[PDB]
Design a protein around this ligand. Structure first.
Ligand SMILES: [Mg+2]
Ligand SMILES: [Mg+2]
Ligand SMILES: [Mg+2]
Ligand SMILES: [Mg+2]
Ligand SMILES: [Mg+2]
Ligand SMILES: [Mg+2]
Ligand SMILES: [Mg+2]
Ligand SMILES: [Mg+2]
Ligand SMILES: [Mg+2]
Ligand SMILES: [Mg+2]
Ligand SMILES: [Mg+2]
Ligand SMILES: [Mg+2]
Ligand SMILES: [Mg+2]
Ligand SMILES: [Mg+2]
Ligand SMILES: [Mg+2]
Lengths: 124, 128, 4, 109, 225, 44, 216
RNA sequence: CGCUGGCAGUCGGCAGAGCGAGAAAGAGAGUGGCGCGGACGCUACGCCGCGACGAGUAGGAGGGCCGCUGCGGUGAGCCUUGAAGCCUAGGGCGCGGGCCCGGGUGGAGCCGCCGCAG
RNA sequence: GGGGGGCCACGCGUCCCCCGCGAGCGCACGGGGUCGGCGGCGAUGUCGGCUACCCACCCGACCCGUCUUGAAACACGGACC
């Protein structure tokens, strides 16, 4: 279970960094990038990831389907959102709230998606 | 155009001087690093008036402002570009220090990525 | 019920 | 056109005999020598005015050699017109026996 | 539907509001009667003295049932028998004060701790000042400030002591539940006496401080409280 | 020192502080007319 | 739809009314006063009709926020504070300015403005002090008064009239109210002997002069 | 240190936002007379809240994201666009053990985390 | 019990001994501070830097380790790295 493998990965994971009195995670689907049970991107059956697109613009939203859990090749579905800064914030919020897909990560997903769009702006 | 933190509380430090070792002034063999005196007649561990103070637990900094730089940020050591996407969601409270063994060619790329990720660098003009 |  | 401050002497710090507390200064204002005459000076603003080598910015004026440690009378001291004052930085001990100013503008009358 | 649930929760909230108002009226008229009891107790002792002086005899007042005890020395160099009594009086620190009811078993302990304390007979205003300003309750072995009457009523409500006025009444007139009412109060953490002590090391009748100052404990109470 | 805290702990203190103000004002009004009648007694 | 009425009990002291609960019930007469029992908008275009949203959702969220703060009750803004003024400062008195560029100058007090500051013009033919505010803490109030009760101060002399804008040049409005106030102040100080010369002088401390020994 | 305290209730258009209050127990079921919206959290070995307390030789125990060397794993770790070491009136963090950056010197290797060993 | 001032008293309809939801509106000694208040200076001489370099002054202040009831000891060990 998720709790069972969290008790393995809470201290001896390869994504874990412990320096400068802080702890984080370099996990691929860890939004907010911190080491915790709620935000861990691989122990749960339903995970949400928000990443920048392969090219300059857009936000890729990744979910994990419920069928293939031991099958990591076809486990994650990926969508690309190359739109304005507000309809993507409505879209990801809809994808979480209306689908009831791991609902305690919706504001974290919106806050990550805003940061990616801010990072894709021209610098001053 | 400085990068402000989320909040900037007033930092209260109970002591700003170092805790020097007893009799680290009469000798070069005695370094400045603190050693607790354990002699039978030692006038410092007996807390006589007008002597070198001892590092008690009462000097401990406030937990809200502990490990926090005078710019209001806390610090994270960064070795490569990948360690900044770690810090992008902790943006307004933690900043980056590029490590000393990082070369100038990669150090340029780290601060270039930190500028667009809006992460503050304590040493952006380090090596060049 | 005294105040109605 | 004339003096607007009262003369005081930095007599010393608030102290016992074998301990001294540098965050409170003992002040001897000229003309007051009893406790029934020192309630006028309570709450007034103190000024240690001195001169240094480097120039510092002057509020409403050109930069000059003059700089001041500001302070305030807090309470009466002793029984013979001495007062206690607290300053924002503790007073240097080279000013013992020297003039400081007690202003009038924190005025209750 | 929820239209019955909302009005049911409103009636519950209304019942909670009327139960609180009836309790506040009860506290008000309890204090109003305690005022009359204090007036009767003050005027009766004057009346009984006057009517004895008219006939030419003497009126002997009853010795007071209540005393206030203040520890007036430190914890260095203390005899063991005296340490045990100073702990049973809950005076573990200098300038601590407590209310002690008086009997033979109490006078024979205050005689043992006599050079280390300064006790006396408190005024009604002294009890008012002490309970209102320094009143802390011992609730779940925690020193809790008496900021609301519920704090008293939750612990002493089974002895019908439900406010500050009931607490002050049960302390001043030593009642049935005086032991519970006094043990509910934390020992009073009082300051140093303003003005100064006369002489800590000697008895009060030797021009010092220790022992029994009968009517003059209030003069120490105002300068120490 | 805090009136509404005192009323929170003791609602009867409102009337015990309205009295010892009203009767003090009335007794002060009595003593000043008594002293003014003394000044008229030393004038007549 | 009732006409608003004042409080039916006087302030005996602060926080305590003069009449009690039942007496106040009787004065108010409640014995015969018993009782018993958006976001969107429609807009057309030229296809269909749009429900245009007012206060649309934000386009950006920061990474972290500060939480809301607890509620205090006694904390009011400066425009709602009560203005205290000490009993020695009454309209018409003579003040000594202690802290401006007009140090030690004797001036005439007119009125206290809405900010609490004092509106002062010790006359410009005597002091070179204009219609100007000063703070009452930094002012020595001398016990020397004139009758000023028939002096018509203009109504536009307010806090906003004396607030700074941003070389400062004199304006003709400030020049004509300066003449208008002084023309009715100056004959009232020229009646008292030596008062204009007293105003033209500057207060100072000399040897042996201690402010706690002398009365003002 | 104690309360062997509190928080899995983030229970959301499959919704109804609570358990501080003087008084053992249920905001219980049935049976008859437009606008698609709602901060943070929870490394539970974590976070939060109330009180009380703080001397120390000999000695005992606990915690060290204190320090040194080597090994198994791990950082798609660092490095001749400059490693170790050394120097520094430079900037700092930590109560402290100590540590991280800046400048110089130097020319080839070195470190962080999880465990192991001396 | 009979014939001027304060009252946390203001129902109607009985039996009877003593003779369970009114709405609103603001003010605040009310579960720990705010201002919906302001003023001065700032590009080659000035602003900030508590700590760290040197110096000055006041108060304090005997050299450590060890044995010992007791060490600053005219008790032993100790130039420095
Ligand atoms: Mg010894
Ligand atoms: Mg000069
Ligand atoms: Mg002794
Ligand atoms: Mg005194
Ligand atoms: Mg003795
Ligand atoms: Mg200890
Ligand atoms: Mg050096
Ligand atoms: Mg000395
Ligand atoms: Mg030896
Ligand atoms: Mg011997
Ligand atoms: Mg021994
Ligand atoms: Mg020795
Ligand atoms: Mg000797
Ligand atoms: Mg030997
Ligand atoms: Mg030797």
């Amino acid at each position: 279970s998720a709790h069972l493998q969290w008790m393995v990965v809470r201290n001896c994971s390869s994504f874990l960094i412990k320096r400068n009195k802080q702890t984080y995670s370099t996990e691929p689907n860890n939004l907010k990038a911190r080491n915790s049970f709620r935000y861990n991107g691989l122990i749960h059956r339903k995970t949400v990831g928000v990443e920048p697109a392969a090219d300059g613009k857009g936000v890729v939203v990744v979910m994990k389907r419920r069928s293939g859990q031991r099958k990591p090749a076809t486990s994650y579905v990926r969508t690309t959102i190359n739109k304005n800064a507000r309809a993507t914030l409505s879209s990801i919020r809809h994808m979480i709230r209306k689908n009831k897909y791991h609902p305690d990560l919706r504001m974290a997903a919106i806050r990550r998606a805003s940061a990616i769009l801010r990072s894709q702006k021209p610098v001053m | 155009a400085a990068l402000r933190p989320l909040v900037k509380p007033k930092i209260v430090k109970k002591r700003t001087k170092k805790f020097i070792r007893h009799q680290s002034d009469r000798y070069v063999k005695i370094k400045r690093n603190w050693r607790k005196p354990r002699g039978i007649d030692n006038r410092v561990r007996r807390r006589f008036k007008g002597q070198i103070l001892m590092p008690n637990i009462g000097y401990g900094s406030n937990k809200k402002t502990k490990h926090m730089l005078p710019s209001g940020f806390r610090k994270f050591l960064v070795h490569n570009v990948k360690e900044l996407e770690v810090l992008l969601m902790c943006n307004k409270s933690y900043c980056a220090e590029i490590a000393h063994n990082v070369s100038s060619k990669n150090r340029k790329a780290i601060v270039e990525r930190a500028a667009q990720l809006a992460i503050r660098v304590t040493n952006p003009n380090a090596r060049l | 019920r005294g105040l109605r | 056109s004339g003096r607007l401050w009262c003369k005081a002497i930095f007599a010393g710090y608030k102290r016992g005999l074998r301990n001294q507390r540098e965050h409170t200064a003992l002040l001897k204002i000229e003309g007051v020598y009893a406790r029934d005459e020192t309630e006028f000076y309570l709450g007034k603003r103190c000024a240690y005015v001195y001169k240094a080598k480097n120039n510092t910015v002057t509020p409403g004026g050109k930069p000059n050699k003059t700089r001041v440690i500001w302070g305030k009378v807090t309470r009466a001291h002793g029984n013979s017109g001495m007062v206690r004052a607290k300053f924002r930085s503790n007073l240097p001990a080279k000013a013992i026996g020297h003039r400081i100013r007690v202003m009038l503008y924190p005025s209750r009358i | 539907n929820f239209a019955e649930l909302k009005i049911k929760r409103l009636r519950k909230k209304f019942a909670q509001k009327m139960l609180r108002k009836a309790r506040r009226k009860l506290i008000y008229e309890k204090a109003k009667h305690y005022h009359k009891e204090y007036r009767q107790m003050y005027r009766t002792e004057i009346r009984m003295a006057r009517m004895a002086r008219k006939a030419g005899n003497f009126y002997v007042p009853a010795e007071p049932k209540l005393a206030f005890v203040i520890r007036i020395r430190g914890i260095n160099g203390v005899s063991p028998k005296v340490r045990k009594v100073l702990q049973l009086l809950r005076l573990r620190q200098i300038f601590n004060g407590t209310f002690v009811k008086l009997n033979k078993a109490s006078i024979n302990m205050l005689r043992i701790v006599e050079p280390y304390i300064a006790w006396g007979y408190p005024n009604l205003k002294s009890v008012n000042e002490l309970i209102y300003k320094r009143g802390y309750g011992k609730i779940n072995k925690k020193r809790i400030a008496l900021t609301d009457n519920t704090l008293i009523a939750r612990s002493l409500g089974k002895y019908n002591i439900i406010c500050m006025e009931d607490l002050i009444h049960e302390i001043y007139t030593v009642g049935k539940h005086f032991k519970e009412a006094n043990n509910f109060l934390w020992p009073f953490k009082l300051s140093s006496p303003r003005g100064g002590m006369k002489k800590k090391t000697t008895h009060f009748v030797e021009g010092g401080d220790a022992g029994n100052r009968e009517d003059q404990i209030n003069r120490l109470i105002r300068r120490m409280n | 020192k805090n009136l509404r805290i005192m009323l929170k702990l003791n609602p009867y203190a409102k009337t015990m502080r309205r009295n010892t103000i009203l009767r003090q004002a009335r007794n002060h009004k009595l003593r000043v007319e008594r002293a003014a009648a003394a000044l008229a007694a030393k004038s007549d | 739809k009732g006409k608003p009425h004042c409080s039916r009990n006087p302030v005996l002291v602060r926080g305590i009314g003069r009449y009690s609960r039942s007496a106040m019930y009787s004065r108010k007469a409640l014995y015969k006063r018993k009782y018993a029992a958006l976001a969107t908008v429609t807009k057309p275009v030229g296809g269909g009709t749009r429900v245009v949203k007012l206060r649309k959702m934000p386009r950006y969220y920061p990474t972290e926020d500060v939480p809301r703060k607890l509620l205090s009750h006694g904390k009011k803004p400066f425009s709602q504070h009560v203005r205290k003024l000490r009993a020695s400062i009454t309209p018409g008195t003579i003040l000594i300015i202690l802290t401006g560029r007009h140090r030690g100058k004797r001036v005439v007090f007119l009125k206290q403005l809405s900010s609490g500051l004092l509106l002062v013009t010790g006359p410009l033919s005597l002091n070179r002090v204009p219609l100007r505010r000063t703070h009452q803490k930094f002012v020595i109030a001398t016990s020397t008064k004139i009758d000023i009760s028939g002096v018509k101060i203009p109504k536009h002399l307010t806090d906003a009239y004396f607030k700074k804008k941003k070389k400062y040049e004199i304006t003709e409005q400030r020049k004509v109210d300066q003449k208008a106030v002084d023309s009715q102040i100056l004959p009232k100080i020229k009646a008292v002997p030596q008062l204009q010369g007293y105003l033209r002088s500057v207060f100072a401390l000399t040897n042996g002069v201690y402010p706690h020994k002398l009365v003002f």
